[PDB]
Amino acid sequence: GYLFSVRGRVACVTGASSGLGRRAATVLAQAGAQVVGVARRADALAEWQAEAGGETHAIPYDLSDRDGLEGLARQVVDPFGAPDILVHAAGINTRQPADEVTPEGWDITLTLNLSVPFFLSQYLVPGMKARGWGRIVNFASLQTTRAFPGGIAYGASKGGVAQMTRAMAEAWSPHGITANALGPGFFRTELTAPVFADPERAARNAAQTCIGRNGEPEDLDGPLLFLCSQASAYVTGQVLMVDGGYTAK
Amino acid sequence: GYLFSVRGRVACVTGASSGLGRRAATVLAQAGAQVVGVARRADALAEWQAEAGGETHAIPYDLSDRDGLEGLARQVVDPFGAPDILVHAAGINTRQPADEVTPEGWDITLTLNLSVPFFLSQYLVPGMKARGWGRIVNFASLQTTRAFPGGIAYGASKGGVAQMTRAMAEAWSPHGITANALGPGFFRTELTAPVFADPERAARNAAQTCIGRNGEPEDLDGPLLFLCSQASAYVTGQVLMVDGGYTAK
Amino acid sequence: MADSGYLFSVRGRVACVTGASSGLGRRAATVLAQAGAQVVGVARRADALAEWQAEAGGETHAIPYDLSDRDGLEGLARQVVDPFGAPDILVHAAGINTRQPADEVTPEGWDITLTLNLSVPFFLSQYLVPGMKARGWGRIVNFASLQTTRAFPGGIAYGASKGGVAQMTRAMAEAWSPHGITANALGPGFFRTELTAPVFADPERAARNAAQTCIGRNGEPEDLDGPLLFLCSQASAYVTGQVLMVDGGYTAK
Amino acid sequence: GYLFSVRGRVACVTGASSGLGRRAATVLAQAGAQVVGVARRADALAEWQAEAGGETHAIPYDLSDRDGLEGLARQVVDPFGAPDILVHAAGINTRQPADEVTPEGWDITLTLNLSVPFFLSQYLVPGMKARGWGRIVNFASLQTTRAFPGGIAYGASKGGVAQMTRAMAEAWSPHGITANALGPGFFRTELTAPVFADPERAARNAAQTCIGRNGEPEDLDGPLLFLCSQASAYVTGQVLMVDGGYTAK
């Protein structure tokens, strides 16, 4: 049971003001990790801190600013020290189908979904190396493997994430840092507004799973804590789909 | 914490007299499940029961006898009631290269590794359906995806296990039964004796992982309990590799 | 034809195709015979085999044999080599789907699916590989499925077998490709055959499956020709241990 | 039994001055396609043209310049009319290990290996759509799936490529355009000089394949022509590994 603890660890979670990142940041805080939540909007982070309890700190930062990311990383280590756990839950889907992709929509998708996870990890790994222990949790997608309408830049980024996660393990796992990717199926969030707003679409997606339902926020708590804890010490370089068996059918 | 509990559950573990099945059976028992361990040898099962503590029951049975499996299933329900968790860890690798495969070595490999998991599952799922809750844990392999010397029947069986696991989810997960496969990399057991007996070979395999070491028995505890608990309710039809990132390189 | 077109030649090769009386096996056997291979077709029924030989043209030979008979496979292999000499190309197109859902699977329906779809491909290949090794050249083509990776209703024994096939194909390559023999699996999507009668018989089903592909249609027989000949020729010399999906992009969505 | 013809087609091949791109452009020229070859250096493009024979046109262009891509596309259509076949063989591997990745090295790899193929496709697909027929050939890698030393940006890009190819099929294959990726193993080129320069490394990689050898230029011809012809009309969204079975072990 100790096996699954994150008590006394330090975590940084990006995308912590909404969606699955907010859930992850709250789970980790309620499980006793000290949590640094990063997202654009101070007011949304303050509501997060109010719900989350435990011991947290908020940092408003626009993760589309890559030049500033090394300064963010210094901010991240200030409240509680170097993080042991890093969760890259910030992300975007512009939903531009191929013929309508703009340079701007392509670029913001690769920046936020792929490049920012890489560099923020690069900046934060030294502290983990020093302790000989770290957990990196990237966010893969059904669109790591299956192309959906409007998804082309998103799936490019998310096929990138999976290989990036393997490459993170190849570089950093000899030093005690594991890197894996949670692959949520369809959960009600900001990214999935069209999939859920049309109920016929939502129900088709539910029927595509083996269980027969879409995801609820609580469905990610277990797999998150597993990937953030001693339980997963020999699991690295893997994508763990949390999708009710969508990918089995 | 409670998310990862197996207290009050009943598990059946095949292959419980040695190797990874014995580890799984012990972990489950120490974690508060009632465990029914199935293996060929009574004396080996009795040593298991002695190591394990908790509440367990041993059933000596030669799982190559498929005609008898329905009777085995009735034996398995008798000590503690119908199992909630089933772990198919019994297996064989005859190590016959393709040109030397015999009908008998082929057939015993398919029987033990593929057909027995299916039928014992078939017999034991009714009790899970009645409760609307179940966990099936199959054993996949690096040879689900990568062909090793002497491996052809083994890999046929383990490729089959991966797809069988997705098919178990498609059949059974509407009823609250999840089916997943643990994919150990190289752990010191009965099946892996040549991989370990030559140290140069053992070290090449260790170097193929991201972490740089082969598996130890404790490395499977976390992933097992995750796959046997509430924590993985929305995880079904998946193969979860516990291989130190062997498959990432 | 460009000189490189001759990379895809099967002229003067010997092929054995199982399942040659119907479905995709029959198309594969006919394509190879029309492309100038000498083709040994294996199937249960002498009469359906005769219809095949009539359609095919070229140079062919029929062998009626019940591939559920593993005992007799070594004697099949002797029969296969008799008309044209040892085959250079082996195509394992015989297969079954009993469509029994998990709760209704019988020992017999599980068993016949593993026999025909997995064990027979293995043993027949084992018996015919020596001839290929003697020449330093061979092509094995197995049949994978959408159900190599995605579980469909009634599919559980079939999927077990087809996930098996994929790994078995990797293992055939690991054992035999040092000797000049490549082994790959074609993965057809949904094509109109014996095995897919329920998928097609309900038009709404057929259309949902067409819409699941990227192109928007189910398979037609001729769609298998190119991929088959590629996997049976010099063109694929450095392609081994692979599953080649011919599914209109079903598996991309 | 022609099916595999490219006679009469127009092809655009990027990276046509060296390596596998140069092989592809020559193969397609010698098979009777009119070929537009795109690469940085006029003089190396001119040697190519001399070597190739057939009917060709060279366009010197720095593919790191995304701003000018729409203009390149106009140049590409000028000599022979709109291309039917597009082969994205230009690529880079900076070989920076994770801890030493620079923003510039990461950016150039995503640009050349992922963003350029998307945009140049986007600009050239209209011509294909008008005819109801096209073929797009991307370049995947062993690092689509397996992380090698120095590979992290490359691998990010190439996992991106494979999803991008699936998403290209989803967008464009209803209009007669197929999109697939060739996945070469290890062939003697600019990208792979350290793998080949050290003979012990070269031999280890050869031994990792099923056949037991590295690739030769001619090994790409058949798989290329298959992906560029009528033969592959019902093959779309696929990665076709041309690796001697590296990925089977």
Residue numbers in the entry:
A (entry chain A), B (entry chain B), D (entry chain C): 5 to 253
C (entry chain D): 1 to 253
What does the paper say about this structure?
Dihydroxypropanesulfonate (DHPS), a globally abundant organosulfur compound, serves as an ecologically important currency for nutrient and energy transfer from phytoplankton to bacteria in the ocean. R-DHPS is also a substrate for the dehydrogenase HpsN. All three dehydrogenases generate stable hydrogen bonds between the chirality-center hydroxyls of DHPS and highly conserved residues, and HpsP also form coordinate–covalent bonds between the chirality-center hydroxyls and Zn2+, which determines the mechanistic basis of strict stereoselectivity.
The crystal structure of RpHpsO shows that it exists as a tetramer in the asymmetric unit, with seven-stranded parallel β-sheets sandwiched by six α-helices, constituting a typical Rossmann-fold domain in each monomer. RpHpsO is a member of the short chain dehydrogenase/reductase (SDR) family, which has two defining features, an N-terminal domain responsible for coenzyme NAD(H) or NADP(H) binding and a C-terminal domain harboring the essential catalytic residues. Ser145 and Tyr158 both formed hydrogen-bonding interactions with the C3-OH of R-DHPS. The Ser, Tyr, and Lys residues are conserved in other SDR family enzymes and constitute a catalytic triad, suggesting their essential role in RpHpsO catalyzation of R-DHPS. This demonstrated that Ser145, Tyr158, and Lys162 function as catalytic residues in RpHpsO. Gln147 formed a hydrogen bond with the chirality-center hydroxy (C2-OH) of R-DHPS, suggesting that Gln147 may have a vital role in specific recognition of R-DHPS. Mutant Gln147Ala abolished the most enzymatic activity of RpHpsO for R-DHPS. These results demonstrated that the interaction between Gln147 of RpHpsO and C2-OH of R-DHPS appears to drive the specificity of RpHpsO for the R-DHPS enantiomer.
